[PDB]
Amino acid sequence: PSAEEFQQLRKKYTDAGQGHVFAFVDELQTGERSQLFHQLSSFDPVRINELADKALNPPASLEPLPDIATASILDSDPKDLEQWYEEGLKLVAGNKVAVVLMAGGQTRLGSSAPKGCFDIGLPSHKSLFQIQAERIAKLQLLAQRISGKEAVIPWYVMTSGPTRKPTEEFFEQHKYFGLNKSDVIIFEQGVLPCISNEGKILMESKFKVAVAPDGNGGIYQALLTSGVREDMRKRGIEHIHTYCVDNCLVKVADPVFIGFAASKQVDIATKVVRKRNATESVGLILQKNGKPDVVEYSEIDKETAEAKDPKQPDVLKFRAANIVNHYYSFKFFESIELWAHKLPHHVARKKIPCIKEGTGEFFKPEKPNGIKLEQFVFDVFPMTPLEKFACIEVRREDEFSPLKNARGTGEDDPDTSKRDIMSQGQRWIEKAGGIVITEGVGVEVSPLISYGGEGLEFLKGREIKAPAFIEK
C-alpha cells in the first residue's frame, strides 16, 4: 500500500531480473495493485531464480528392493494376515489412525469439478469422495465391534487453490457423507509460480502472477502451516494413511496395511501392485543407491522400463508399481521441518496462457512456453533407511483402479473404474454364497454393507440380478 513498501518490492524484483511483472502497474486499479503487491510479496524472487536456474540448467545404481524390505498379501502367512488385520483394527479402535486424502489435482479427465466429485456411473451414482467416506464410516463401525466404544478416524482432505472451494461446498451439500463435520478437515497445499523457458515469472493477468499447485509432495509443508499436524498431535494420532483421490478401489485406512506397518515398526510403508506392462504410467518402487526410492514414469529411461529379470525373460526387472497408498508414523511427521526443504522440484514443460511481456495481450501459447514445478510425496523414501521402510504388494483387482482419463478412453477411466468396483462386488457376494445371474454387469456393494467382503452372509443362497446395488 505505501509507496515506501511498493518501491522496496519493486527494487527486489527488478534487481532479480524480474522487473517485467511491474510492466503494467500504471494501468492498474488500486485493488489490482494491492493484489499484485501481496502476491509478489509472498515469493522471494531470488529463490524463484534459484528454482528456475536449477530447473532450466540442471547439473546411479538401481536394483529391486531387497526382500527384507518387501512383503506380499499374495503370499503372506495367513496367520500374519489375520494378526495384521486385528492389530490394525485395534489401532483404529484406539483412535490412533488418521487419513490424509490427496485431492489437489485438477487434467486428463476434462471435468470442471474436483476429481473426487466425479460420478463414475455406478447404480448409486456415488462420487469417489462419498465411497471413500463410507469406507471410513464402515471401518469405524468394524473397529467398534472389537471395543464396544466409538472409533474415530479423522479425515484430512488436502485440496489445491483450484479445488478447495468446490470440495468444501460438495462436502457440505452432502453433510459430510454422514461423518461428523468436526472429524473432517479440508486444507490446502501451496503454490509455486510458473516460469517461462527463459526463467521469467509468467503473468496470468496484468496484475496476477501465474502459479500452480506445488505437487502432492507439498503435503508435508501443508501439514504444518494448515495446523493438521497439530490437530493430529492433539488427537493422539500415531499412524497415518495417505492416498490419492482418484483410485475408486482405495482401501481407506486399510487395517491390514496399518497393522502390517505398525508391527514392523517402520517410519514409512507403501503399497504396490504388479506393473501391468512396460509403458504403464506409474512410478516404480525400487532400491536406488542402497535406499528406498521411486522413479516416476515421466522420468524413467526406456532402457530401465524394459529391463528384464534374468531367469524370466518376459518379465520386467522393475515391476513394483506405486499405487499412492502410503503409511507414516506420527513420529516421522514430527520431523517435517528438518527436511521439507530437501524435497526436489520436478519439472514439466507446459503451455501456460499468459500476458506477452511487451504488448500485454493475453494469449494461449502454440508450443510449450514455460515450466511447472512439483515436489513428489514419495521423495521422502530415500530419507528413510531400508530397515524403517516396508513395501507390500496387493491385488490390483481389489486395490487399484485409478480414474485418470475421460469416459471413452478405454483404460483408467470411468468405465474401467465402475467395472472394477462392480466386478469386486460380485466376487465378494459369490464368495459369501450369493448367486449373480447376468443377462447382459457385476454388483455394486455399498461400503456401509461391506468394507472388504465381510458381512455378506445374509446373501448366502440368494440370487442377484446384475446389475444390482446392495445398500443398507
Ligand X SMILES: N#Cc1cccc(N)c1
Which residues are near ligand GN1 by CB under 6 A? 216, 244, 282-283, 296, 321-324, 376-377, 402, 404
Q: Which contacts of 298-306 are long-range, i.e. CB under 8 A and separated by 24 or more positions? A: 298/346, 298/348, 299/346, 304/62, 305/278, 305/279, 306/278
Q: Which listed residue (134, 188, 238, 267) binds ligand X by CB under 6 A?
A: 267
Q: At its nearest, how many Å lie between ligand A1IIG and the CB of residue 374?
A: 4
Per rule CB under 6 A, is residue 261 in the interface with ligand X?
A: no
Q: Does 115 bind ligand A1IIG (CB under 6 A)?
A: no
Q: Which does 424 bind (CB under 5 to 8 A by kind): ligand A1IIG, ligand X, ligand GN1, none?
A: none
Partner in contact with 348, chosen from ligand A1IIG, Mg ion, ligand X, none, beta carbon below 5 to 8 Å by kind: ligand A1IIG
Q: Which is nearer to ligand GN1, 97 or 323 (CB)?
A: 323
Cell of 205: 493477468
CB 345 within 8 A of CB 375: yes
Q: Which of residues 101, 383, 390, 403 is near ligand X by CB under 6 A? A: 383
Partner interacting with residue 70 (select from Mg ion, ligand A1IIG, ligand GN1, none; CB below 5-8 Å by kind): Mg ion
Asked if 225 and 386 touch (Cβ cutoff 8 Å), the reply is: no
Q: Residue 67, interface with Mg ion (CB under 5 A)? A: yes
Backbone breaks in the chain after residues (C–N over 2.5 Å): 59, 106, 440
| Chosen from ligand GN1, Mg ion, ligand A1IIG, none, partner binding at 323 (C-beta under 5 to 8 Å by type) | ligand GN1
Tell me the three state secondary structure of residue 72: strand
Q: Would you say 67 is a known binding-site residue? A: yes
Question: What are the C-alpha distances in Å from 44 to residues 39, 49, 50, 193, 361?
Answer: 11, 9, 10, 11, 26
CB of residue 282 vs ligand A1IIG: minimum separation in angstroms?
12
**Interface with ligand X includes 438 (CB under 6 A)?**
no
Amino acid identity, position 373: L
Closest CA to 403 of 156, 117, 99: 117
The SS3 of residue 117 is helix
**Under the criterion CB under 6 A, does residue 404 sit at the interface with ligand A1IIG?**
no
Q: Identify the DSSP state of 413.
A: S
Tell me: is residue 301 an annotated ligand-binding position.
no
C-alpha 159/C-alpha 156 separation (Å) is 10
- Quote the CA–CA distance of 388 and 376 in Å, as a whole number: 20
- Residue 265 sits in the site that holds ligand X (CB under 6 A): no
> Which residue ranges make up the site for ligand A1IIG (CB under 6 A)?
298, 346-348, 372, 374
Report the binding-site residues for Mg(2+): 67, 70
Report the binding-site residues: 67, 70
> Which residue ranges make up the site for ligand X (CB under 6 A)?
267, 331-332, 335, 338-339, 383
